[PDB]
Amino acid sequence: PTIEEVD
Amino acid sequence: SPSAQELKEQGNRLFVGRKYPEAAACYGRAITRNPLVAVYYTNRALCYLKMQQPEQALADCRRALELDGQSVKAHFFLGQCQLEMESYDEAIANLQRAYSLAKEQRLNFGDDIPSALRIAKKKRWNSIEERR
Numbered sequence: 001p002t003i004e005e006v007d
Numbered sequence: 008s009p010s011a012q013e014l015k016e017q018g019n020r021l022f023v024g025r026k027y028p029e030a031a032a033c034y035g036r037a038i039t040r041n042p043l044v045a046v047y048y049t050n051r052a053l054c055y056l057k058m059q060q061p062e063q064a065l066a067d068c069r070r071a072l073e074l075d076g077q078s079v080k081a082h083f084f085l086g087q088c089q090l091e092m093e094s095y096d097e098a099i100a101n102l103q104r105a106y107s108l109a110k111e112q113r114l115n116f117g118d119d120i121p122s123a124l125r126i127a128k129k130k131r132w133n134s135i136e137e138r139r
Contacts, residue, residue, distance in 0.1 A: 003083055003116035006022045006030075006050040 011040035015047060022050070027057045045075035052084045061091040079108045083120065086127065095131035102127055 009017065018033030031054035037047045048071040055064035065088040071081040086101035106120045 001115060001117065003080065003119040004053060006019045006053060007046045007080070 009036075011037045011044070011047075014040065015044075015050070018050060022054065027054045030054050031058070043074060045071045045078055045081070048074070049078060049080040049084060052081070052088075056084060056087055061088040064088050077108055077112070079105050079112065079114055079116075082108060083123065086123065090127055090130060093134065095127060095134065099124065099127045099131070 014033055014037035018030045018037060021027075021030035021033055031051050034047050034051035034054065037044070038051075041047075048067040052064040052067035052071065055061070055067065064084060068081045068085040068088065071078050072085075075081065082101045083105040086098045086105060089095075089098035089101060102120060102124045106124065109116060109120060
């Protein structure tokens, strides 16, 4: 998983 | 007449489609229906970063932090904004804070945060080298 994704 | 949740989900789909201005607008609509959800602002901040609009992203990070002071993503995206602005010490502090918060919360973003810290420290050092 990357931190540059939407929740 | 979609719900706030439906609008966030539509925004997320547009984000997957790399339609960043459209996604950001969708998150704005979600915020209209419920402005007290920190995730809408951090999602929109990410869109603004992809759109090379760090000023708009930074404002969204502030809105997010007012609602959720423990937000890992708000601190991380804030750090990215600050790097674009050449405010290196601030950026590093925010990235370090994101790392600390992610650890406390047991979140897994792979090596994303340490990678960002290395970029920030490299850029700070480059700024010194560029001036002598």
